[PDB]
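Action item from last meeting closed. Structure (293 res):
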């Protein structure tokens, strides 16, 4: 009994929205992951330090984006439906590096927890029907509008390990997406299981002051001041993967950001910059509706 008003047409979006952002191995079993209370600034088993290993099923919207041949790990991504996947544009299109991947170059692995171990009946491979990149994606400057959608060849089957994440409404965005609230990034970064780091959202004027890159409203930032030592490293989060927050309103995980880039990954305190998913919902709806059926 946790209420959620679906936003998208299941005809174009595929299925998954009504039950989005509730994890089968956690919210559905009345269980909690080892660090989610830390997002509430509450510490129960001791200060963890830096980032740590995710538990089986902690992040069932996690999607890895691979280059087909030769098989190499390109980026993170997130599953928002059985049919649609979110990622960062520069993962696919980056001219300064002569990077321009299309559907045929790529596959996605969904449901993985380890990496030095395959997963029977657990991880799914899936090919891509089509890639959609924001047309005002700016790679020349600041990575403005760093967001892309990828449609799966065939809809994936949801399991305990595969389940989509929710996308925010105005009210959720207005309330969760503010300084001092904490979010969560995940990445593979030699570590051998998916790493989780929790990070506080940083105020816009401080984000603007940490860098000479022009920061636009299509971006937010999270992390700790260059002062602040062994805390939690934003740069652990793989480019294009999700920045997620738990709504106290309804116990649901919402994807607030797409990991775009890191600032000062060579400092004591690192800041992460994220594509503002809510400011882009308009564009996401536009592509799902045009291209989803």
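Sequence:
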């Amino acid at each position: 009994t946790s209420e959620y008003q679906t936003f998208f047409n299941p005809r174009t979006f595929g299925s998954g929205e009504a039950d989005c952002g509730l994890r089968p191995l956690f919210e559905k079993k009345s269980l909690e992951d080892k660090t989610e209370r830390a997002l509430l600034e509450s510490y129960i088993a001791g200060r963890i330090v830096a980032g740590s290993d995710a538990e089986i099923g902690m992040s069932p919207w996690q999607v890895m984006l691979f280059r087909k041949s030769p098989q190499e790990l390109l980026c993170g991504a997130s599953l928002i439906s059985d049919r649609w996947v979110l990622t960062a544009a520069h993962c696919l299109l980056y001219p300064p590096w002569d990077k321009n991947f299309t559907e045929n170059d790529l596959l996605v692995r969904i449901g993985k927890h380890s990496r030095t171990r395959y997963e029977r009946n657990i991880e799914k491979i899936s090919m891509l029907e089509k890639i959609y990149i924001h047309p005002r994606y700016n790679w020349r400057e600041n990575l403005d509008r760093d967001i892309a959608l990828m449609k799966l060849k065939k809809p994936v089957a949801f399991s305990d390990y595969i389940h989509p994440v929710c996308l925010p409404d105005r009210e959720t965005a207005a309330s969760l997406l503010q300084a001092g609230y904490k979010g969560r990034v995940t990445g593979w970064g030699q570590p051998s299981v998916l790493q989780v780091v929790n990070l506080p959202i940083v105020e816009r004027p401080v984000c603007k002051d940490s860098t000479r890159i022009r920061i636009t409203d299509n971006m937010f930032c999270a992390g700790y001041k260059p002062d602040e030592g062994k805390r939690g490293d934003a740069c652990e989060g793989d480019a294009g993967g999700p920045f997620v927050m738990k709504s106290p309103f309804n116990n649901r995980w919402y994807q607030m950001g797409i990991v775009s880039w890191g600032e000062g990954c060579d400092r004591d305190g690192k800041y992460g910059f994220y594509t503002h998913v809510f400011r882009l919902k308009k564009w996401i709806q536009k592509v799902i509706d045009q291209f989803g059926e």
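Note appended to the action item: The longest strand covers residues 253-263.
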